[PDB]
Structure formats: C-alpha cells, structure tokens
Amino acid sequence: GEEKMTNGQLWKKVKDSLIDSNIISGNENEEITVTYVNKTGYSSSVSAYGNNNDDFSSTPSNFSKLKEIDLKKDNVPSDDFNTTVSGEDSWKTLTSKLKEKGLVTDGQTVTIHCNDKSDNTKSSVSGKVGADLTSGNGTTFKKRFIDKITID
C-alpha cells in the first residue's frame, strides 16, 4: 500500500474521475482548484488545467481527508458545447472513480451545485459514499454551469 502522493499526483486522481464522467472536456480551457487536508489541520488547494497532467508542487504526502473544490470552465468549443449531465450522473461516475484511489471515506456527503444562468435556475445534488442520492436526482443540468462543489 503506497497510497502516498504529491499535490499533482493527488489532483490527477481527482481529475481523471471527471474524464470518465461527462463533466469536463479535459482541455486547456477548464481549471479545478481542489482543496484537501492531511492528518494535521493544514488545508491545501491545488489549481490546474484539464490538458496534460499536474505537477507544479513538491508538497508532502500526509493525505488523509478532503475539503471543497472550486471549478472553472471557459466558453467551450463544438466538441462538448452541447454537453449536459443528468445531475445524479454528474455525482455518480465522479464518486465511483475516487474510492478507487482511496480519495473518499465511507460516508462522506459530496454536494454539487449547478448555477445555470440561462432561464433563472439553480440546484444541488447530494448523497453518501456508497448509497444513491437522497437529494437532487431525477433531473439534468448543463456542463458549463456546474461550478461549486463542497463536502460535509
């Protein structure tokens, strides 16, 4: 068990989740600031773009826990321009990709907003690690307008 890694190597394992899902293109036009915390009370944000891997820090490998995420996307080109996500779906694959690398704990409440600035609509979805969604599901939201994620 060599589940120790840097900012870059951690954040990659928290990026490639969203690649499996339909939430990001993985272009040079999306950035994700993932905040996490170690055994000690020290938070750490790591902010990087969806082209390439991330490695711009030589940070310690005391990883133990998570904190929020801040999300950013530009005006996306044709490939992914129509992309929307079935709300539940945009929590499902994401969470289903993180325990693979031990990057959630067994009951965390991962909460995802949508901030749609089209027809005056916003919402959120929420569940636990392992269950299905007791809040949010049965609905769909646009890719470009999902930009705020927190954990309990």
PDB file of C-alpha atoms in Angstrom:
ATOM      1  CA  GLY A   1       0.000   0.000   0.000  1.00  0.00           C
ATOM      2  CA  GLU A   2       1.819   3.044  -1.415  1.00  0.00           C
ATOM      3  CA  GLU A   3      -1.182   5.423  -1.410  1.00  0.00           C
ATOM      4  CA  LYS A   4       1.178   8.421  -0.877  1.00  0.00           C
ATOM      5  CA  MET A   5       1.450  11.234  -3.441  1.00  0.00           C
ATOM      6  CA  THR A   6       2.046  14.998  -4.022  1.00  0.00           C
ATOM      7  CA  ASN A   7      -0.437  17.781  -4.939  1.00  0.00           C
ATOM      8  CA  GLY A   8      -0.035  16.961  -8.651  1.00  0.00           C
ATOM      9  CA  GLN A   9      -0.256  13.197  -8.327  1.00  0.00           C
ATOM     10  CA  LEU A  10      -3.290  13.507  -5.946  1.00  0.00           C
ATOM     11  CA  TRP A  11      -5.146  16.102  -8.038  1.00  0.00           C
ATOM     12  CA  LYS A  12      -4.676  13.937 -11.199  1.00  0.00           C
ATOM     13  CA  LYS A  13      -6.538  11.048  -9.449  1.00  0.00           C
ATOM     14  CA  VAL A  14      -9.280  13.657  -8.632  1.00  0.00           C
ATOM     15  CA  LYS A  15      -9.230  14.922 -12.296  1.00  0.00           C
ATOM     16  CA  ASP A  16      -9.382  11.638 -14.225  1.00  0.00           C
ATOM     17  CA  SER A  17     -12.639  10.806 -12.414  1.00  0.00           C
ATOM     18  CA  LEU A  18     -14.346  13.708 -14.241  1.00  0.00           C
ATOM     19  CA  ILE A  19     -12.782  12.439 -17.526  1.00  0.00           C
ATOM     20  CA  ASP A  20     -14.694   9.145 -17.083  1.00  0.00           C
ATOM     21  CA  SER A  21     -17.779  11.265 -16.369  1.00  0.00           C
ATOM     22  CA  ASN A  22     -19.143  13.814 -18.891  1.00  0.00           C
ATOM     23  CA  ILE A  23     -18.499  16.870 -16.661  1.00  0.00           C
ATOM     24  CA  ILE A  24     -15.288  18.249 -18.283  1.00  0.00           C
ATOM     25  CA  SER A  25     -13.628  18.039 -21.720  1.00  0.00           C
ATOM     26  CA  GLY A  26     -10.079  17.864 -20.305  1.00  0.00           C
ATOM     27  CA  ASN A  27      -8.943  20.824 -22.471  1.00  0.00           C
ATOM     28  CA  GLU A  28      -6.650  23.795 -21.721  1.00  0.00           C
ATOM     29  CA  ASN A  29      -9.883  25.805 -21.093  1.00  0.00           C
ATOM     30  CA  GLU A  30     -11.035  24.264 -17.746  1.00  0.00           C
ATOM     31  CA  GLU A  31      -9.302  24.626 -14.314  1.00  0.00           C
ATOM     32  CA  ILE A  32     -10.074  22.864 -10.994  1.00  0.00           C
ATOM     33  CA  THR A  33      -8.914  24.115  -7.585  1.00  0.00           C
ATOM     34  CA  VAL A  34      -9.195  21.001  -5.324  1.00  0.00           C
ATOM     35  CA  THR A  35      -8.790  21.733  -1.610  1.00  0.00           C
ATOM     36  CA  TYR A  36      -7.822  18.804   0.670  1.00  0.00           C
ATOM     37  CA  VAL A  37      -6.420  18.297   4.202  1.00  0.00           C
ATOM     38  CA  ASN A  38      -3.864  15.925   5.780  1.00  0.00           C
ATOM     39  CA  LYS A  39      -3.699  14.176   9.184  1.00  0.00           C
ATOM     40  CA  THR A  40      -2.707  17.600  10.542  1.00  0.00           C
ATOM     41  CA  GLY A  41      -5.098  20.589  10.408  1.00  0.00           C
ATOM     42  CA  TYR A  42      -3.416  22.017   7.240  1.00  0.00           C
ATOM     43  CA  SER A  43      -5.641  22.626   4.232  1.00  0.00           C
ATOM     44  CA  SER A  44      -4.049  22.866   0.752  1.00  0.00           C
ATOM     45  CA  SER A  45      -5.659  23.993  -2.533  1.00  0.00           C
ATOM     46  CA  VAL A  46      -4.208  22.756  -5.856  1.00  0.00           C
ATOM     47  CA  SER A  47      -5.361  24.515  -9.066  1.00  0.00           C
ATOM     48  CA  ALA A  48      -4.554  23.110 -12.548  1.00  0.00           C
ATOM     49  CA  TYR A  49      -5.966  22.826 -16.081  1.00  0.00           C
ATOM     50  CA  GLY A  50      -7.526  19.871 -17.864  1.00  0.00           C
ATOM     51  CA  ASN A  51      -4.977  19.420 -20.586  1.00  0.00           C
ATOM     52  CA  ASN A  52      -1.900  17.377 -19.500  1.00  0.00           C
ATOM     53  CA  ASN A  53      -1.031  16.020 -16.026  1.00  0.00           C
ATOM     54  CA  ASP A  54      -0.452  18.189 -12.990  1.00  0.00           C
ATOM     55  CA  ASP A  55       2.935  18.566 -11.309  1.00  0.00           C
ATOM     56  CA  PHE A  56       3.921  22.096 -10.155  1.00  0.00           C
ATOM     57  CA  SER A  57       4.472  21.496  -6.405  1.00  0.00           C
ATOM     58  CA  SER A  58       6.722  19.289  -4.196  1.00  0.00           C
ATOM     59  CA  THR A  59       4.136  19.022  -1.364  1.00  0.00           C
ATOM     60  CA  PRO A  60       4.096  16.369   1.438  1.00  0.00           C
ATOM     61  CA  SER A  61       2.167  13.072   1.334  1.00  0.00           C
ATOM     62  CA  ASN A  62       0.348  13.230   4.684  1.00  0.00           C
ATOM     63  CA  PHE A  63      -3.010  12.945   2.759  1.00  0.00           C
ATOM     64  CA  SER A  64      -5.939  11.815   4.926  1.00  0.00           C
ATOM     65  CA  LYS A  65      -9.070  13.868   4.124  1.00  0.00           C
ATOM     66  CA  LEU A  66     -10.823  16.155   1.655  1.00  0.00           C
ATOM     67  CA  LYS A  67     -12.203  19.695   1.589  1.00  0.00           C
ATOM     68  CA  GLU A  68     -14.172  21.611  -1.095  1.00  0.00           C
ATOM     69  CA  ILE A  69     -13.452  22.084  -4.820  1.00  0.00           C
ATOM     70  CA  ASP A  70     -13.689  25.224  -6.924  1.00  0.00           C
ATOM     71  CA  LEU A  71     -14.395  24.595 -10.604  1.00  0.00           C
ATOM     72  CA  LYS A  72     -13.899  26.813 -13.705  1.00  0.00           C
ATOM     73  CA  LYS A  73     -14.704  26.313 -17.419  1.00  0.00           C
ATOM     74  CA  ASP A  74     -14.306  28.671 -20.397  1.00  0.00           C
ATOM     75  CA  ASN A  75     -16.592  29.059 -23.436  1.00  0.00           C
ATOM     76  CA  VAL A  76     -16.279  25.505 -24.715  1.00  0.00           C
ATOM     77  CA  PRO A  77     -15.868  24.632 -28.461  1.00  0.00           C
ATOM     78  CA  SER A  78     -18.189  22.427 -30.579  1.00  0.00           C
ATOM     79  CA  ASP A  79     -16.985  19.034 -29.204  1.00  0.00           C
ATOM     80  CA  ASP A  80     -18.569  19.423 -25.786  1.00  0.00           C
ATOM     81  CA  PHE A  81     -20.630  22.601 -26.409  1.00  0.00           C
ATOM     82  CA  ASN A  82     -23.988  20.773 -26.186  1.00  0.00           C
ATOM     83  CA  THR A  83     -22.913  18.742 -23.160  1.00  0.00           C
ATOM     84  CA  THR A  84     -25.249  18.456 -20.196  1.00  0.00           C
ATOM     85  CA  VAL A  85     -25.209  15.995 -17.303  1.00  0.00           C
ATOM     86  CA  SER A  86     -28.124  14.111 -15.704  1.00  0.00           C
ATOM     87  CA  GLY A  87     -27.347  15.587 -12.202  1.00  0.00           C
ATOM     88  CA  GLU A  88     -27.240  12.251 -10.425  1.00  0.00           C
ATOM     89  CA  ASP A  89     -24.969  11.109 -13.312  1.00  0.00           C
ATOM     90  CA  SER A  90     -22.584  14.024 -12.574  1.00  0.00           C
ATOM     91  CA  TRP A  91     -22.217  12.773  -8.943  1.00  0.00           C
ATOM     92  CA  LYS A  92     -22.238   9.009  -9.840  1.00  0.00           C
ATOM     93  CA  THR A  93     -19.151   8.432 -12.056  1.00  0.00           C
ATOM     94  CA  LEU A  94     -17.216  11.123 -10.096  1.00  0.00           C
ATOM     95  CA  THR A  95     -17.737   9.406  -6.727  1.00  0.00           C
ATOM     96  CA  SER A  96     -17.423   5.929  -8.406  1.00  0.00           C
ATOM     97  CA  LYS A  97     -13.881   6.931  -9.575  1.00  0.00           C
ATOM     98  CA  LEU A  98     -12.458   8.326  -6.272  1.00  0.00           C
ATOM     99  CA  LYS A  99     -12.646   5.370  -3.813  1.00  0.00           C
ATOM    100  CA  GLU A 100     -10.518   3.511  -6.438  1.00  0.00           C
ATOM    101  CA  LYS A 101      -7.590   5.632  -5.181  1.00  0.00           C
ATOM    102  CA  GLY A 102      -8.905   5.864  -1.567  1.00  0.00           C
ATOM    103  CA  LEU A 103      -9.821   9.554  -2.179  1.00  0.00           C
ATOM    104  CA  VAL A 104     -13.165   9.423  -0.369  1.00  0.00           C
ATOM    105  CA  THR A 105     -14.134   7.970   3.041  1.00  0.00           C
ATOM    106  CA  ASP A 106     -17.101   5.636   3.550  1.00  0.00           C
ATOM    107  CA  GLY A 107     -19.966   8.043   4.242  1.00  0.00           C
ATOM    108  CA  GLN A 108     -18.755  11.488   3.016  1.00  0.00           C
ATOM    109  CA  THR A 109     -21.543  13.804   1.850  1.00  0.00           C
ATOM    110  CA  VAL A 110     -20.230  15.178  -1.523  1.00  0.00           C
ATOM    111  CA  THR A 111     -22.574  18.062  -2.567  1.00  0.00           C
ATOM    112  CA  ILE A 112     -22.628  19.506  -6.156  1.00  0.00           C
ATOM    113  CA  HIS A 113     -24.422  22.743  -7.160  1.00  0.00           C
ATOM    114  CA  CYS A 114     -25.495  23.922 -10.630  1.00  0.00           C
ATOM    115  CA  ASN A 115     -25.534  27.689 -11.279  1.00  0.00           C
ATOM    116  CA  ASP A 116     -27.499  27.865 -14.550  1.00  0.00           C
ATOM    117  CA  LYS A 117     -27.507  31.440 -15.922  1.00  0.00           C
ATOM    118  CA  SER A 118     -29.915  30.822 -18.812  1.00  0.00           C
ATOM    119  CA  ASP A 119     -33.539  30.595 -17.595  1.00  0.00           C
ATOM    120  CA  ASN A 120     -33.079  31.510 -13.917  1.00  0.00           C
ATOM    121  CA  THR A 121     -32.476  28.032 -12.443  1.00  0.00           C
ATOM    122  CA  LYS A 122     -30.008  26.658  -9.827  1.00  0.00           C
ATOM    123  CA  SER A 123     -29.988  23.432  -7.753  1.00  0.00           C
ATOM    124  CA  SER A 124     -27.737  20.932  -5.964  1.00  0.00           C
ATOM    125  CA  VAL A 125     -27.407  17.118  -5.618  1.00  0.00           C
ATOM    126  CA  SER A 126     -26.229  15.107  -2.583  1.00  0.00           C
ATOM    127  CA  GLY A 127     -25.793  11.530  -1.295  1.00  0.00           C
ATOM    128  CA  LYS A 128     -23.231   9.433   0.701  1.00  0.00           C
ATOM    129  CA  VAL A 129     -20.299   7.342  -0.500  1.00  0.00           C
ATOM    130  CA  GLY A 130     -21.924   4.022  -1.431  1.00  0.00           C
ATOM    131  CA  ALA A 131     -25.628   4.939  -1.418  1.00  0.00           C
ATOM    132  CA  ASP A 132     -27.775   6.538  -4.103  1.00  0.00           C
ATOM    133  CA  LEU A 133     -28.888  10.143  -3.931  1.00  0.00           C
ATOM    134  CA  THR A 134     -31.368  11.156  -1.214  1.00  0.00           C
ATOM    135  CA  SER A 135     -31.255  14.762  -2.605  1.00  0.00           C
ATOM    136  CA  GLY A 136     -31.013  16.011  -6.204  1.00  0.00           C
ATOM    137  CA  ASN A 137     -31.687  13.068  -8.544  1.00  0.00           C
ATOM    138  CA  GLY A 138     -34.151  12.699 -11.457  1.00  0.00           C
ATOM    139  CA  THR A 139     -33.022  15.998 -13.093  1.00  0.00           C
ATOM    140  CA  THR A 140     -30.365  17.310 -15.600  1.00  0.00           C
ATOM    141  CA  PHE A 141     -28.107  20.424 -15.671  1.00  0.00           C
ATOM    142  CA  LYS A 142     -25.665  21.953 -18.178  1.00  0.00           C
ATOM    143  CA  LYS A 143     -21.940  21.213 -18.116  1.00  0.00           C
ATOM    144  CA  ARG A 144     -20.865  24.854 -18.499  1.00  0.00           C
ATOM    145  CA  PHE A 145     -22.890  25.996 -15.405  1.00  0.00           C
ATOM    146  CA  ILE A 146     -21.709  23.424 -12.796  1.00  0.00           C
ATOM    147  CA  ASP A 147     -19.173  25.483 -10.778  1.00  0.00           C
ATOM    148  CA  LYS A 148     -19.346  24.861  -6.972  1.00  0.00           C
ATOM    149  CA  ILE A 149     -18.711  21.587  -5.072  1.00  0.00           C
ATOM    150  CA  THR A 150     -18.352  21.152  -1.290  1.00  0.00           C
ATOM    151  CA  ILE A 151     -18.139  18.163   1.058  1.00  0.00           C
ATOM    152  CA  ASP A 152     -19.728  17.869   4.522  1.00  0.00           C
TER     153      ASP A 152
END
